[PDB]
Design a protein around this nucleic acid. Structure first.
Ligand SMILES: [Mg+2]
Ligand SMILES: [Mg+2]
Ligand SMILES: [Mg+2]
Ligand SMILES: [Mg+2]
Length: 46
RNA sequence: AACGCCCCGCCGGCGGAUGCCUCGGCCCGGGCGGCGACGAAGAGCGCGGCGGAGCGCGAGACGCGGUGCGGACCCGCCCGCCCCGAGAAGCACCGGCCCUCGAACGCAGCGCGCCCCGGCGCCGCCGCCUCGGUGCCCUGC
């Protein structure tokens, strides 16, 4: 023992493994490419 | 004087009483007694062919689908429907979609992380896995 300090030991850590899915159906969002673009702007400067 | 001011007989203003009318209030009785981590109540911001407030709805947005009933309209301009079903207005139930904050849950409030595969809040109960103790013992050494 080269250190005078008691530290919590190291124990095995597991990963998540749910019994049932939290999001059974994959759903879309706002980020579809065609809906992302709205419309062009039309002016003489443009 | 005459004008001005103040008092009768007609006509005009200004104002809004009165009378009549009201899809509104107030009281009494009866029923009901049903919200939420499967994300509530509340807030913000968006959504209409021409669209400000209110209602409604949520990037599937002024609504989508199913099953029954209904049977000619759709407040403006348009578009649509028209028929022994071919289907406008309406009504009931059922299935889904459901942006940001909020008990509000990776941190923070509009910015930024960890992670290796996708996901990452707290407290409790039960169960399991991996461990600590000069606690009570035991064995071997
Ligand atoms: Mg969507
Ligand atoms: Mg409005
Ligand atoms: Mg949040
Ligand atoms: Mg927070």
């Amino acid at each position: 023992r080269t250190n005078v300090h008691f530290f919590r030991p190291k124990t095995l850590v597991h990963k998540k493994a749910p019994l049932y899915p939290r999001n059974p159906i994959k759903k879309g969002s706002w980020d579809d490419p065609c809906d992302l673009l709205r419309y062009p702007i039309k002016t003489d400067e443009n």
